Design an enzyme around this catalytic site. Sequence first.
Site, PDB file in Angstrom:
ATOM      1  N   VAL A 210       0.816  -1.215   0.000  1.00 39.37           N
ATOM      2  CA  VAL A 210       0.000   0.000   0.000  1.00 39.37           C
ATOM      3  C   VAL A 210       0.848   1.261   0.000  1.00 39.37           C
ATOM      4  O   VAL A 210       1.770   1.379   0.814  1.00 39.37           O
ATOM      5  CB  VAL A 210      -0.932   0.035   1.233  1.00 39.37           C
ATOM      6  CG1 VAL A 210      -1.688   1.356   1.317  1.00 39.37           C
ATOM      7  CG2 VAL A 210      -1.894  -1.140   1.205  1.00 39.37           C
ATOM      8  N   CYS A 211       0.530   2.203  -0.900  1.00 36.71           N
ATOM      9  CA  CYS A 211       1.219   3.493  -0.961  1.00 36.71           C
ATOM     10  C   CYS A 211       0.351   4.547  -0.279  1.00 36.71           C
ATOM     11  O   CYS A 211      -0.704   4.921  -0.799  1.00 36.71           O
ATOM     12  CB  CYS A 211       1.522   3.876  -2.418  1.00 36.71           C
ATOM     13  SG  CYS A 211       2.490   5.395  -2.642  1.00 36.71           S
ATOM     14  N   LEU A 212       0.785   5.002   0.895  1.00 36.21           N
ATOM     15  CA  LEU A 212      -0.026   5.887   1.737  1.00 36.21           C
ATOM     16  C   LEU A 212       0.906   6.675   2.638  1.00 36.21           C
ATOM     17  O   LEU A 212       1.797   6.088   3.244  1.00 36.21           O
ATOM     18  CB  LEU A 212      -1.026   5.074   2.562  1.00 36.21           C
ATOM     19  CG  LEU A 212      -2.030   5.818   3.444  1.00 36.21           C
ATOM     20  CD1 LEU A 212      -2.931   6.715   2.598  1.00 36.21           C
ATOM     21  CD2 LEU A 212      -2.866   4.817   4.236  1.00 36.21           C
TER      22      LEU A 212
END
Length: 156
Positions: A91-93
């Site tokens: 996940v890119c967050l």
Amino acid sequence: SGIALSRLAQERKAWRKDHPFGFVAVPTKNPDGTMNLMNWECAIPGAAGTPWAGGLFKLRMLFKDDYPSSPPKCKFEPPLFHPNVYPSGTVCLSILEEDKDWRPAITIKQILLGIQELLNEPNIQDPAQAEAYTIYCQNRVEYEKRVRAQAKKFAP
Ligand SMILES: Oc1ccccc1-c1ccccc1O
């Protein structure tokens, strides 16, 4: 890591006491059957009234020995169609990057709610996979069609 394990026990107690409905977050087991607090199996329900509704999206949460200095790595298993999820599933967050918006005080509950919110509202500044990002930009109707199909695929 004593520091990490103490905090993870704290997180487990808090989660079990109070957590959002339909979410799951549980530590895994070592080969000898004992609890492994450094590796959690989680599931995030799609929000009702959204294209994600009815899906249940599984992900692994992996903690480093210096947690909570560092955020966990959060990885959908299997990988998901979403502009901000790498093909690996990761996940890119911003709250999941030490040098961006991670803070040690952020809880597992806040992480999982943060990812649920991300699912339904992609960040166009953080393209992580080419296909879902391109479709999101070019055709929102097609995008949502793919998302609804995915939610059906991952219905419990
Ligand atoms: O199957 C599940 C059911 C509930 C919660 C998590 C999982 C899971 C999450 C990541 C990886 C494997 C898993 O089994």
